[PDB]
Structure formats: C-alpha cells, structure tokens
Nucleic acid binder design. Structure first.
Length: 1334
RNA sequence: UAAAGAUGAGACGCGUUUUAGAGCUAGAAAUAGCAAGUUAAAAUAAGGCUAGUCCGUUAUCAACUUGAAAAAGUGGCACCGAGUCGGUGCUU
DNA sequence: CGTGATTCCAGCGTCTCATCTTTAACATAGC
DNA sequence: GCTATGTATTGGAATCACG
C-alpha cells in the first residue's frame, strides 16, 4: 500500500479536497460506473471540490415563528372579546359577528348582507358619513354621554384591542399630564424651593422646543444645559432632566450616597428605587421626583400627541381627527391650486395610480416619502403654496391615520381610552360594567418573556410548567402557569452544563461555594519564605482557615502585603516573609460573603454550615430571576430568618453571571479510598497542596476515573459547535468527504490530513488619522498638497503622509514625483514576521539606508531618528508597537526568542473553529488508545492558515483567478496538502506548534535555521535582504532524517502539471430545496392559472393569491395523458415540478397525486427523483444542472491553460521593480496571445454554452475595443469569464456593452440525456440512460 | 475589561390582498367633465393533529441492497500519457 | 402560434429580555 | 500543548416581437 495524505480547504460555499502520494503527485484511478449505460470504468484524478449553497441562519425562521404566534394570539384576543359580547350582541344583531367574519368574501359567496356593520346600505352610508374614521367613533364614545349602539362600542373596543401599541413603558402614564412646559416650570419651582440657596434661571429657555425636538436625548439635554450656564449635565438638575428624558442618571454623587443610585423611570423597579431614596436623604425630594415623572410623561406625549388636553380625555383620537381635518383642508387647497395653475398635471396627480402622485399615494402603492419626493417640485413650481411646503418640510402633509410611525404609541393611551369608554357606557349595559376588568386585562395582558409559548409538551421551544389541566386564559394566567418553575426553566435550559459532568448543571457565578473553591484553589499554591525556613512550604488547613477568617472574611479584597503583615507578623511573629505564586493583589475574593454580611448583618449565620444550602438557595434566587416580584415570592420561604428590611435589601440586591464548574464536581463526589471530596482535598492536602487541576488529573484518585466514566452523533456533535451555520455545514461536508476518500483508498487511513479554512467572510479613517496627526504636529503638508480619500488607498501615498513627507530612516524629506523610485520595506523582514499591515511598513528612499536589513534596523538609524519617531508617535502617526520595532536595536535587537515567537505566530492558528474541526477529525480518524491511556496518532490532523498558501502562490507564480472556474478550490486544497506535508517533513519538531495533539529556543541558531522564515526553503534563489542573492541546495532534505523533502527539479514541474490537469472532480451538492411555499407578496386578482390560493375556499380568480412556487425536487414521470379531444393515451415523459407545498401530498401517495395532475398509467418503479443541481450529460460533453422543473444551468468548467491564467493575473494587477518589468514584458508578449483566450472562450461557448447572440456580441465588442489598453482588456476578459462559469447564468459588462444572461428555460433535451448520480466526492458515479425509459 | 456573532422567548408598527365604503352630471353607449380619496372587517405562508394561546421556511439528503429509520453495506492494482480523461500491462 | 428575446421582480421597519459562544486586552495555577 | 482560574441571486411570470 502507498501511504498518502489528504489536503482540505474549507469555505462558506466550497470544500476542496485533494489526495497526494509521495513526490506530491495526484493519483489517477479507474472507478466503476453503475447504471444501465455502456461505460464500465472511468479514469478520475484524486483532486476535486464540492459546491453547495451557503448555510442559512434560523433567524428568518425564528421571526416567522414569532409572527405566527403573534397573529394567533391576536386572533384569540378578538375571539375572547367576541365571546364577552356573545349574548348581548346576539340579542341586538344576530349575525353581526358572522358578517364581520365573512367580510373578505365576494358578494357572490357571502351568506349574509354585504354591509358588515349594519346589514343595510342606508345605515352604513349614514354611519360612514357621521364617522369618517374609527377614531371619530372612539372620540365620540369617549366624550359623548348618550347611549350608543352596541355594535359601535364593539368596533371601538376591537380596534383598540387588535392594535394596542407597544409595552415599552410600564406603570401609569397619566395622559392628562401633557404640559411640556408648565410641568417643567412646576418642577423648576419645586427644585428652587428645595434649593433656595442655588436657584436656577429658567427664564428665556423654551422647554417645549428643546425637550420635544426630534433629536436624541443627549443632544437635547446638552441644548438645555447650554442655555443654563450655571448648571451642568451631570448636576442634580441635569440628572433630573436626564431621568425625565429616560436616561440613567447617577444620584449617588449628587446625594453623596454610598449606594449607586441608578434610577430609570421605564423599569418597573423604579418605584422600589424611589423607596430606597425615601430612606437615605428624606421625603422632601419625593414630590420633586413626582414632578419629574410628570415631566417625563409630557415629553413622551410631546411627539406622539399634538392636541389640547382639556377638550377631551382621548388625546389620541383627537389628534387623529385633527390630522384628518388637516388632510382634508390640504387636499382641497392642493386641488384648487393645481386646477388654477397646472391643469395638465392634475390628471397625473389625482388619477394616475401608477405614478407617485396622490392617486398612487392613496389607491396605488406609494409611501409617504415617495409621495413627498414626487410632489415637492410640483409644489415649488406652483404659486401661493406656503403652508403645504411648511408641512412637507415637517413631514406632516396629507398624513394618514394609519402611518408607519404609530409604533411609538404606548398601550397606556389605548387602555385609558377603553377605560373611559367603559365608564361612559356602563350605565346603559350591565355586562360592560361587570366585565370591565376582563376587557382591560385582555388589552393589557402579555405573556412574560420568561414563560415562553403556552404549549403542553409538543413544542421544541417550550419550557412552561403548569399547575392544573385547563385552558390558559388571560384571566387565570397566574392560577395556571407556575411562574417560578417556568422562569427557572427559562434560564436553566440555556446555561451550559459542566464540561467534566455533562449531565450536571453549572453553579451561579456568585455562589458562596464557588467563591470558597476559587479562594482555596488560589491559596493551595501559596508558599511563604522566612529566615528560619530552609525551604518554602505550603499553608496547612488550619493556617488557610486562619488566613481566610482574618483577611478573606474581613476585607473585600486581600493583597499580598495584607497577607504578609496581618498574619505572619501578627500571628506567626514573622518579620520577613516572601510569597510565591501571587503578584499585585489576589484575584479571588469573597464578594458574596461580604455582601451577605453587609445585608443580613449576621457573620455567624454565614459561618454556619447548616445554612449553606439556604445560602445557596438565596444566591441562585438572585441570579435566575430579574423580576423583583419573582425574587420576593421565592425569598418569602426564608423570610422568617431575616427581618423585612433584610428582605427588601435582598430584593434590591441582584447580580448576574454563571460559573463554569458544577456543584457535584466540587462537593458532590467523594474519593472512594480517602472519603474526601474535591473541596475536602483542597482544604487539606497534606503538605503537597494539590490544586484542582492536580486533583482531577491524579491517577491515584478516583476523581479522574469518575470524570472519565461520567463524560461518556456526528450531526449533533457538529450542531453544538460555536460558529455560523454555513461554516458548520462546510465542516460536516468536509468530514463526509474525508470518510469517502478513506473508503476510496481501500480503507487505509492517511498519514496526514491538512486542513485550511479560508476566512469568516477605510479611506475616511486614514484621512481622519492624517488630519489628527497633522493638527497635533502643526505641519503644512496637507495644506500645500491636497489628497483625496481614494488616492490614499495606495500604500506609498499613505506612508508618505504618515511620515510627514520625510524618510523614516534618514533625516530628509521625500518628493511625490519620486514615489515611483521610492521603496517600501518592512521593519521586521518578511523572512522573520510576515506582516503586511501599516504597523510593520516603512516608506524609504532606498533599503540600503536601513543598514543591516537581515536584522532590525541598525542602532545608527535609531540614534538618528529616535526623536523623529517619538514626535510621530506623539501625533498618533505611528503606534507604540511600530516605534518599539523601529527602536528594537537599542533593546537587544531581534533576539532568538523573538524569532521563536515569530515562528509560533506564523504557525499557530488563532481561530478556535479550526481547532474544533481538527479535534473532531482526530477523534473520528484515530480510535487507538494504548494501554498507557494515550491515543495512537495514526492520523495527523494538521492546521494551516490561508496567508502562507497565498504567499506561496504569489511567490512561485501559481496564480489563481476566482472568476475563471471553480478549479481554484481544488488547487488550493492540493497546495495546502503539499505545503503541510513538506513542512511536517522538513521540521517535524514543529508538529506540536501546528498539529493538533499533545507531544523551542534550540531551533534558532539540531538548530533548524538562523532566520525565522519557515517556507523559505522552497525558494530556488534566496535574497539576503542586502542584494546578496544566493542559492539554496537544489535538493532540500531534513538533516537529521536525511529524507528528501523538496526536489526543485521535479516538485515544481509536478505542481505545474497538477495545476494544469484538465479533469477535476467539481461536484455541485444536489439538495432538495426548502423554505417558503412561494413569494410572500400577494398579487391582485388576475385571470391566470399561475396564482396560488391563499385559502382553501378563496379562488385566486377572485381574491388573488401567491405566485412563483418554489420547487423542492422535480420528478421524471413516464405515464400517459388524455391527449387531444379523442383522449388518446399517448405515452409521455416529462419533468413535473413538485412544489414545497405539494411535497407532503406527493410523498404520502405519489400515485394519486400524479393522477390528479392528468397523468395516467403511472409506472411506480420508473419514478425518478431529481433534486436541484441534478447533473445531465446531453452530448459532446455538454453537461447541465437541473436548476428547476423548467430551467437549466451551465455545468461544465473551462480548463484554461496555466499560461493564460498567469497572463491574466499579471496583466490585470489582480493583487522588486525588475520583477515587475519582466512581468510587464510577459504581459506584452502574451498580449500577442490575447486573441487565443477569446478563441478558447468562443470554442467552449460553441461546444457547451450554445449562446449564439451573446457570443457574437462579445466578439463584436472585443473587435471594437481591440485598441483599448492591455490591462483594461484583461479585466474585461476576466469579466467575460462569467459567460462560461459554472452555475446560474448571469449578465456581465464588457467595457460599456452590457450582455444579459441567457436562460435555458426548456428542459425537453435532458429527457433523452444521461443522468449522473455523483457521490459526495463525485468519484463514484451512477450514469443512467434516460432515453431507455418509455 | 470592551466589542461582535449564534440561539431562544415576548411584543409593536406597518405593508400587501378581497369586500364595505351607494359616485354624480351629460353623452344611446363607448366617452368627456365634475365630485370623493385618509377608514374599517378578515387573512397574512396552503394547513396538520398531538387540538395546545401547539406546530408548519433551521439543520439533513448522489444511486442500489438491507435496515421502520437513524444507520450499515455495495465499486482492483501498477504504468504511459492528458481538452474535462484516455491508452497499456497483471487478476478478474 | 410556438418561440426566442426582453423586462420586472421579489414583504418591511422597530422594541425588550435571557443564554451561549467568539474576538481584542492580561496574570495565576497545573497534567 | 493544552486545560482550567479571575480581569445579491436568480427562478417565475409576464410581455414583446417575430419568423
């Protein structure tokens, strides 16, 4: 057997895989072809890629699910309201509800009168004349005292309930308090009365304009403060203003309180905070705060409500009616003015729904902003239009009642209006008086966020716990739903379990046991050194307890100085003690212990072990719940131990956070032999003082064995990872591909598996930085030389501006016209730390001025330019790291340790997702753990970063073009494999740095090299950074092993051949499409069969419906249809589109479903399921992917020669002046070959694309633009590559000529082609001849 | 310490559809002129049964055999070349 | 009267709460 | 070496020449 290696390149939409044997050669194997075709064996290379649509997050699905729940709950609310009115409405109008329900149906299908409200034309007309809108009805019901018809009352209540506004404000809003300035004046007067020593000059300041401005709270606060020179934003009055605005002012400083007096009116805990303030400073401020609350209410009412408050107690309805009347007046005036001045546009405005005029604004589809945009020039053109212009500038012209900005309306307004209506009308209807509370509750009822859906054990999102088996109506919500259990579950279901005990549940972060464990763990490794002690010794259990009692149980923080003084000097009488393992202060502290001591004021209660659980039950209670009512209810069980003041303090106290170790891992499990737990061992470990890591990793203790036993699905193991769903899908596909490849090679696991993951996915900032630096320095470079943001994208110009137009190495300036001859050099050479960022770059006239380029710039340059670099640093032109790198010469230069660190940086992978992937592959591939409890590393999972491979490609001219074809994924995978294998062969000792598993200074000059480069040995010629070009040995081999790792005379040629291989296994992952049934937009009624009904009885021919259904998978059916008038059973073979809506119906019984669509005598066994991207080979190598039931996609790749790819990369500058000149010469030489690329494209188009018109247009445009510069033509050809790229057709633009996408909207040809079932890797293929069917 | 993404829950405002919002005048009528325009009901993935204030757009999936289904199993090697893979040699 | 070419188009915008992760900053232990 | 501890794209539908 030939031992091989697998390289993989993971990405969002692609997974590249490659198999390499020795000499970095891709094997070519013959694979059997199943099916009924004639082929029996096909040659396939062992490199390819898998293509799939990127994974989608569940965010859209979560939004849709929440929307469905909201709609169901709204409908249930309406049903409850109707049930309240059942008997009375039935007595009044028997079929009023029935008419309301069938209002959507056409008159032909209505079972009652077409007029819903009254059931007759006359009364409906009279009502609509009396009340133009529902708001008029609401205002009338609120104000008028005469008895009204029950139907109007029901309509008003239904309109209030169905649309109730947000709940972002809790408590009572008091809409009558709408005095924007009068309340402000009263607040100022009260403050002055309380603070007569410090009056506030409120004269000359408009409270209304400043506070009701359509601006941010901070901006309006600053504007208010600016008119008060004697008051600041952080002052007591300023903090009151901030509280009124809804901010979070800090009253601790103003009232000199120790407690952080953070109060916000929006929070429901505001009242409790006010009570807390009613116990420290006094009650004299309480009315003051009340006034601020009223002021805040006015501010909230300022923007939403614009109407007088004395006229009525329904300000919302009054404001809506005022807006409606303004709309009527403005419409009348606009019509008059248009008729008077511009009669020709009148029909355009008031009759053209298709335009953005008034007709389209009302009857058609047009937003308010669109209408304003369309009408503003018209208004400007006319004369006598001033009020309309003023309103348009105010966005208050011809406004509707139902606008997009109605979401600011609090539910308190609607609740107050409903309460007023019920009070007015209860004297005429007894049931309204009897059920007023029920209706108010229905309006105000919300399901708490911690309760979740009110399911009964049939949802994967539910966690509610019930108290009785009944229906959870909003009136008995507390009696049924167990608030405590449900709230506890809501938090517990989302917390992580213990890593060592996956079944157990983690402890809260502030648990007393947790803090004790941390403190003891930190104290175990504490040593103390005195004069009389020969050797430092660990602290005994008694000593640890004494120290904890003296320091940890007496001070919030314990310092090293406190430990040395308060214990050794005080108790042990030690005048000189040195502590090891701790610096500065101790991180561990008994914060919860001291907090509880402060609150309950009973140290002995805390010190009692019997209270431990109780104490825990307190701390957990302070973490699970955020609602203070829940906290109080939970703590009521233990309210007997502590006074009511202590209970109130506990309710006020609330901290959050969770630890990472469960209680059983601390005090649950006990060692079998010793009878001690983890905590017991920590409190007394003899003299070794083994800590937690030592306790759980001790092979002489049962703890490790218990952890291993307790610690005992690939899809589930991947779904629990941390990352985007697309990357997770890529990882799963990569694992499946690896399994398939291992099965391919005769079930021989490879020696190495290299993994590289591509990636997860500024001019203004540079301008700002340059301006800040120039203003700090005060130079004149910017003033004399203007620079655009786009021009700053060039590295040379940005570096020139950063260096104040001066050389960074020599005390001299630079010229813009000389930038072409200037050089860019790295402070740390690329052969030590590969950095391409600004922090490690320098613009200099010549590199020879830097001194010894092999090392850090010479100390002479540092002595020359230290002051200049410091001045640049002070202006933020350069960073501290860059300054240190420039001044590293005086700090010992580039030491060997620095080179080792740079090698580590170049080798390690920062991202943890790659680590998780490597761990998963190591676990799956390796299952041989020896008797010594160590896994035998038969398979070496290696990890690599894209930068190294990209540098390799860009250094050895192995260029890539992303748009040419999809072979670049497979080529990247192959290069990853090659580089990983070569690196692990040449530097095996570096495995630990970049190979997952468990297995430095000696490396730098068994010394590997003196430089920090690790990929440099591939270079045939190496530059000594001083122009001393030398050569490495032709055959690179590891010195110790002697095994050849690089054959420059063969490896380069082999790589060139591999990248030039025409056949590459490019496979599109066939996947059944899923999601929404069709486009969610509702179409108006049309006489077309493409419409989809929105309901079972709603014929699309009348009510419209959806269109554009999404096809999950097509089905190739061979059957017969009633062809012609004679109903001749002609055999038919055609693709039928199975929509997502019909998927369940078809899968339940295919025969009946296919018969229902007109197909007869269906062959059950001949049914062939074709998901999206199913592959067809028609003839002459033309392959097509079945995008849908009626559309095809290009499926062939263009195997462009490597020379053309290199020329395209160089000419277009897709990403050493002599090298650049030689590259330009090659670009000119292959420009002679430019027409060959177009010829190849045309040949491929004729062979496989069959797009005659587009090809002719491309040729004509190319012939026209032959005179264009070479680089522009190269870029345009790169764009032209979109014509032949695999996947869906897409339009492109060759210079100024736009070529549209050619669509293959006929699937008749594939019916006689060869269907291909490609495996996950595509090596195992199943060709089926469809022409043999039927 | 600060910042981002993933997941879940509770809520809003719209938006979009059919109907109700008697259009009038004259003109055979088609068609011209004039009036009016803001709102409301219902639905907001068909729907399903486990009938709940439940669930219905995530994730997963080449073909064949077995396995409910999760899952398992089903396919020679070496060499010479290379237009999407061919040809040669040993066993079959 | 089928058929290739050409055109337009797709629901959206907030708010609150909780839990995880991850990235950018460090010290302390271990196996 | 590694684990813990704390600080747009594109398929559908329509429409349009159009032989």
């Amino acid at each position: 057997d030939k031992k091989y290696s697998i390289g993989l390149a993971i990405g969002t939409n692609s997974v590249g895989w490659a198999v390499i044997t020795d000499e970095y050669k891709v094997p070519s194997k013959k694979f059997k072809v199943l099916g009924n075709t004639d082929r029996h064996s096909i040659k396939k290379n062992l490199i390819g890629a898998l293509l799939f649509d990127s994974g989608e997050t569940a965010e859209a699905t979560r939004l849709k699910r929440t929307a469905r729940r909201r709609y169901t709950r709204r409908k249930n609310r309406i049903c409850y309201l109707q049930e309240i009115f059942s008997n009375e409405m039935a007595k009044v109008d028997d079929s009023f509800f029935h008419r309301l329900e069938e209002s959507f149906l056409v008159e032909e299908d209505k079972k009652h009168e077409r007029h819903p409200i009254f059931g007759n034309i006359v009364d409906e007309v009279a009502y609509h004349e009396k009340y133009p809108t529902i708001y008029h009805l609401r205002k009338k019901l609120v104000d008028s005292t005469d008895k009204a018809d029950l139907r109007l009352i029901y309509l008003a209540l239904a309109h209030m309930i169905k649309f109730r506004g947000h709940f972002l404000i809790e408590g009572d809003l008091n809409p009558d308090n709408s005095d924007v300035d009068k309340l402000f004046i009263q607040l100022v007067q009260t403050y002055n009365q309380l603070f007569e020593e410090n009056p506030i000059n409120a004269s000359g300041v408009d409270a209304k304009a400043i506070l009701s401005a359509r601006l941010s709270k901070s901006r309006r606060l600053e504007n208010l403060i600016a008119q008060l020179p004697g008051e600041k934003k952080n002052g007591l009055f300023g903090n009151l203003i901030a509280l009124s605005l809804g901010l979070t002012p800090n009253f601790k400083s103003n009232f000199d309180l120790a407690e952080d007096a953070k109060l916000q009116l929006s929070k429901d805990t505001y009242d409790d905070d006010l009570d807390n303030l009613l116990a420290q400073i006094g009650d004299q401020y309480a009315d003051l705060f009340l006034a601020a609350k009223n002021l805040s209410d006015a501010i909230l009412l300022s923007d939403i409500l614009r109407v007088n408050t004395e006229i009525t107690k329904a300000p919302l309805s009054a404001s809506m009616i005022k807006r409606y009347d303004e709309h009527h007046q403005d419409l009348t005036l606009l019509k008059a003015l248009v008729r008077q001045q511009l009669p020709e546009k009148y029909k355009e405005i008031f009759f053209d729904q298709s335009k953005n005029g008034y007709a389209g604004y009302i009857d058609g589809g047009a937003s308010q902003e669109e209408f304003y945009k369309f009408i503003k020039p018209i208004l400007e053109k006319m004369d006598g239009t001033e009020e309309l212009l003023v309103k348009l500038n105010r966005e208050d012209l011809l406004r509707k009642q139902r606008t997009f900005d109605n979401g600011s309306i609090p539910h308190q307004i609607h609740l107050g209006e409903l309460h007023a209506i019920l009070r007015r009308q209860e004297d005429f209807y007894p049931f309204l008086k009897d059920n007023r509370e029920k209706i108010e509750k229905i309006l105000t009822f919300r399901i708490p966020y911690y309760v979740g859906p009110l399911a009964r054990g049939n949802s994967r999102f539910a966690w509610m716990t019930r108290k009785s088996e009944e229906t959870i109506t909003p009136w008995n919500f507390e009696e049924v739903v167990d608030k405590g259990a449900s709230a506890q579950s809501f938090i517990e279901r989302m917390t992580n379990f213990d890593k060592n005990l996956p079944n157990e549940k983690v402890l809260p972060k502030h648990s007393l046991l947790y803090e004790y464990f941390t403190v003891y763990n930190e104290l175990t490794k504490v040593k103390y050194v005195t004069e009389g002690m020969r050797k430092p010794a660990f602290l005994s259990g008694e000593q640890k307890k004494a120290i904890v009692d003296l320091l940890f149980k007496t001070n919030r923080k314990v310092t090293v100085k406190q430990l040395k003084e308060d214990y050794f000097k005080k108790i042990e009488c030690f005048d000189s003690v040195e502590i090891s393992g701790v610096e500065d202060r101790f991180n561990a502290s008994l914060g919860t212990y001291h907090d509880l001591l402060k609150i309950i004021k009973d140290k002995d209660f805390l010190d009692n072990e019997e209270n431990e659980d109780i104490l825990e039950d307190i701390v957990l209670t302070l973490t699970l719940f955020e609602d203070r009512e829940m906290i109080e209810e939970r703590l009521k069980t233990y309210a007997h131990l502590f006074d009511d003041k202590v209970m109130k303090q506990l309710k006020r106290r609330r901290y959050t956070g969770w630890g990472r170790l469960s209680r059983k891992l601390i005090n649950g499990i006990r060692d079998k032999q010793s009878g001690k737990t983890i905590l017991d061992f920590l409190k007394s470990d003899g003299f070794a003082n083994r800590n937690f890591m030592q306790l759980i990793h001790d092979d002489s203790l049962t703890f490790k064995e218990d952890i291993q036993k307790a610690q005992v699905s690939l899809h589930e193991h991947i779904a629990n990872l941390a990352g985007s769903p697309a990357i997770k899908k890529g990882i799963l596909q990569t694992v499946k591909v690896v399994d398939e490849l291992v099965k391919v090679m005769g079930r021989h696991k490879p020696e190495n598996i290299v993994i590289e993951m591509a990636r997860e996915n500024n001019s203004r900032e540079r301008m700002k930085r340059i301006e800040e630096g120039i203003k700090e320095l005060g130079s004149q470079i910017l003033k004399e030389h203007p620079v655009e943001n786009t021009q700053l994208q060039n590295e040379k110009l940005y570096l020139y501006y950063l260096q104040n137009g001066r050389d960074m190495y020599v005390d001299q300036e630079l010229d813009i016209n000389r930038l072409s001859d200037y050089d860019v050099d790295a402070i740390v050479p690329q052969s030590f730390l590969k950095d391409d960022s600004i922090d490690n770059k320098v613009l200099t006239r010549s590199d020879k001025n830097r001194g010894k380029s092999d090392n850090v710039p010479s100390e002479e340059v540092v002595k020359k330019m230290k002051n200049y670099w410091r001045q640049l640093l002070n202006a933020k032109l350069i960073t501290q790291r860059k300054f240190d790198n420039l001044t590293k010469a005086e700090r010992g230069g580039l030491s060997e340790l620095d080179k080792a660190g740079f090698i580590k940086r170049q080798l390690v992978e920062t991202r943890q997702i790659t680590k998780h992937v490597a761990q998963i592959l190591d676990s799956r591939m390796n299952t041989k753990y020896d008797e010594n409890d160590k896994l035998i590393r038969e398979v070496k999972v290696i990890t690599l970063k894209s930068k190294l491979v990209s540098d390799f490609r860009k250094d050895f001219q192995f260029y890539k073009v992303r748009e040419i074809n999809n072979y670049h994924h497979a080529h990247d995978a192959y290069l990853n494999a090659v580089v990983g294998t070569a690196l692990i062969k040449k530097y095996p000792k570096l495995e630990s740095e970049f190979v997952y598993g468990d297995y430095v200074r000696k490396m730098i000059a068994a010394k590997y090299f003196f430089y920090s480069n690790i990929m440099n040995f591939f270079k045939t010629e190496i530059t000594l950074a001083n122009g001393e070009i030398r050569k490495r040995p032709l055959i690179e081999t590891n010195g110790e092993t002697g095994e050849i790792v690089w054959d420059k005379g063969r490896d380069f040629a082999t790589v060139r051949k591999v990248l030039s291989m025409p056949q590459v296994n490019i496979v599109k992952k066939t996947e059944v499409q899923t999601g929404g049934f069709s486009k969610e937009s509702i179409l108006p009624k049309r006489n077309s069969d493409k419409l989809i009904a929105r309901k079972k009885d709603w014929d699309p021919k009348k009510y419209g419906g959806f269109d554009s259904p999404t096809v999950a998978y097509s089905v190739l059916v061979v059957a017969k249809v009633e062809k012609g008038k004679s109903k001749k059973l002609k055999s038919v073979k055609e693709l039928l589109g199975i929509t997502i809506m019909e998927r369940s119906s078809f899968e339940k019984n295919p025969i009946d479903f296919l018969e229902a669509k007109g197909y007869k005598e269906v062959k059950k066994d001949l049914i062939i399921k074709l998901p999206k991207y199913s592959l067809f080979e028609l003839e002459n190598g033309r392959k097509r992917m079945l995008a849908s039931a009626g559309e095809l996609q290009k499926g062939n790749e263009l195997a462009l020669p490597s020379k053309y790819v290199n020329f395209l990369y160089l000419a277009s500058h897709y990403e050493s002046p002599e090298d650049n000149e030689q590259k330009q010469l090659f670009v000119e030489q292959h420009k002679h070959y430019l027409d060959e690329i177009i010829e190849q494209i045309s040949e491929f188009s004729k062979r496989v694309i069959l797009a005659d018109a587009n090809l002719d247009k491309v040729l004509s445009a190319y012939n026209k633009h032959r005179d264009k510069p070479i680089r522009e033509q190269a870029e345009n050809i790169i764009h032209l590559f979109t014509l032949t790229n695999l996947g869906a057709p897409a339009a492109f633009k060759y210079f100024d000529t736009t070529i549209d996408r050619k669509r293959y909207t006929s699937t008749k040809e594939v019916l006689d082609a060869t269907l291909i079932h490609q495996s996950i890797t595509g090596l195992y293929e199943t060709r089926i001849d469809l022409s043999q069917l039927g």
